[PDB]
C-alpha cells in the first residue's frame, strides 16, 4: 500500500521504555515480512497465540500494535494470556482472546551497566489488578498497612515504583530482556497492514 512497516523503529531503537510506562506504536498502511521472526538471533523467545507463526506473511489486519518494554528475564513468562505475577497483575496485562505474538530477547549488552542501570522501573503495588492493555503511569503512595499515610513515603507507606538493578554479571534470569508484543487487530473494512503475498 506503498509503504513498508517501520518495525525497526520499535525493535532496534537505542533505548526502550520502562514496563510500568510501556510504549505502544500503532502500525498502518504498510507491508512487512514476518519471515524474520522465525530465523533470528540467540535468546529469542517467540510464543504466538491467535495466529500460527507460519501464516503471518499471508494474512491481513486493520491495525497492528507494538507494545515494548524492558522486564527481567525470569519474568518473561508473565507475558502471556491468563498469567499471574507482579508484572501481569500490576504492569502489563494481556487478555485471554489475545490475537498476537510475543517476542523477547536478552539485552544484557544493551541495558545492563557496570554500576547498575537503575532507570528501568516497575510497579510494586496496586490496589487493583490492571485491566488488559492498561498503562498505569501513576505516582501515588501505596499504604501497605493500617495507618493512613496522607501522601508521604514512610513505614508501610511505599512509593509505588521501584528501580530494576541491572549488572552484567547477574546471570540469565536477573538480566534485562527487551520485549515486544505485536497485536493483530481485525475490525472494520480497511485491512491495511498486509504481508508480501
Amino acid at each position, epitope marked *: 500500500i*506503498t509503504n*513498508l512497516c517501520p518495525f*525497526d*523503529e520499535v*525493535f532496534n*531503537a537505542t533505548r526502550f521504555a520502562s514496563v510500568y510506562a510501556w510504549n505502544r506504536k500503532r502500525i498502518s498502511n504498510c507491508v*512487512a515480512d514476518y519471515s524474520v521472526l522465525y530465523n533470528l538471533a540467540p535468546f529469542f523467545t517467540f510464543k504466538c497465540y491467535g495466529v500460527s507463526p507460519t501464516k503471518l506473511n499471508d494474512l491481513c489486519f486493520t491495525n497492528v500494535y507494538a507494545d515494548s518494554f524492558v522486564i527481567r528475564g525470569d519474568e518473561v513468562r508473565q507475558i502471556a494470556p491468563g498469567q499471574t505475577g507482579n508484572i501481569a497483575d500490576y504492569n502489563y496485562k494481556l487478555p485471554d482472546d489475545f490475537t498476537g505474538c510475543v517476542i523477547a530477547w536478552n539485552s544484557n549488552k544493551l541495558d545492563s551497566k557496570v554500576s547498575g542501570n537503575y532507570n528501568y522501573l516497575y510497579r510494586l503495588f496496586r490496589k487493583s489488578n490492571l485491566k488488559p492493555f492498561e498503562r498505569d503511569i501513576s505516582t501515588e503512595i501505596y499504604q501497605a498497612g493500617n495507618k493512613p499515610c496522607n501522601g508521604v513515603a514512610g513505614f508501610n507507606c511505599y512509593f509505588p515504583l521501584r528501580s530494576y538493578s541491572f549488572r552484567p554479571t547477574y546471570g540469565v534470569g536477573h538480566q534485562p530482556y527487551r520485549v515486544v508484543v505485536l497485536s493483530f487487530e481485525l475490525l472494520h473494512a480497511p485491512a491495511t497492514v498486509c504481508g*508480501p503475498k
Partner: antibody
Amino acid sequence: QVQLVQSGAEMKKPGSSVKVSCQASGGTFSTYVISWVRQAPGQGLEWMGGIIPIFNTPHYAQKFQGRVTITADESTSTAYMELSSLTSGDTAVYYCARVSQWELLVYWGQGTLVTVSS
Amino acid sequence: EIVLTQSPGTLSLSPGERATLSCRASQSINSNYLAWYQQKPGQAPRLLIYGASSRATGIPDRFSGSGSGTDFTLTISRLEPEDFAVYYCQQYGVSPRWTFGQGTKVEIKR
C-alpha cells in the same frame, strides 16, 4: 548477516553507459530498500537513488534524472544501476547499501570502481 | 529534499582533547534514521553511530551521538592519533529518500 556482492571494476569510454549490479544472498530481498551511493575521488558521499523491489517504484536524486535508472529483479534478487552519457566527472566508487524494516543499521556493499577514460 | 549541513568544516585538535561535530537539517528529522560514518583515506565509509544514539559493533566507547529534530551531534571524547578522518552524517528512511553531509575533516595538531 546478509551479504551484498557488487559487480567488478569497470572502464567505460566517455559517452557510454554502465550497469553496476548488486545481489542479496537470501534474507528478504523484496522488502529491503536498496539504494546506490557514489563517491568521486577526493569528495563526499552522494546519494543517487533507491528502490523497494516489492514496489518497483524507484526514486532518484535531483542531480540525476535523465541519466540514472535503477531496476531490480525479484528472481535472482539483484538490483541494477544504469548511468548513461558518461563523462570524466563520473569516475567514482559506486556502492549499493540496504536498510531493513527490522533494524536501523544501513548495510553497505563492497564498492565498484568505474573509471571513465579512453 | 533534506539538506544536512555539517559544522565545522575542519577540526585541528591536539590529541586527547574533546571533539564535537554538529549536523543540522533543513527540516526536522525522525532521528531514528540518522547515522554517523568515519572514512579514513583509501577505505570505504565505516558506520559509527546509527539511530542517532547507538554505537555500531566494534566502535570504541569514546564515540557517541545525540540530538533530535534538526540538530544532531557526534562527540569524540579522547581523541587519539588515528582518529583523523572525514566524518559524514547521513539521514535515511525505510523509503528511497536519503542524504549525506558535505563532510567534516578532523586532524591532529603538532
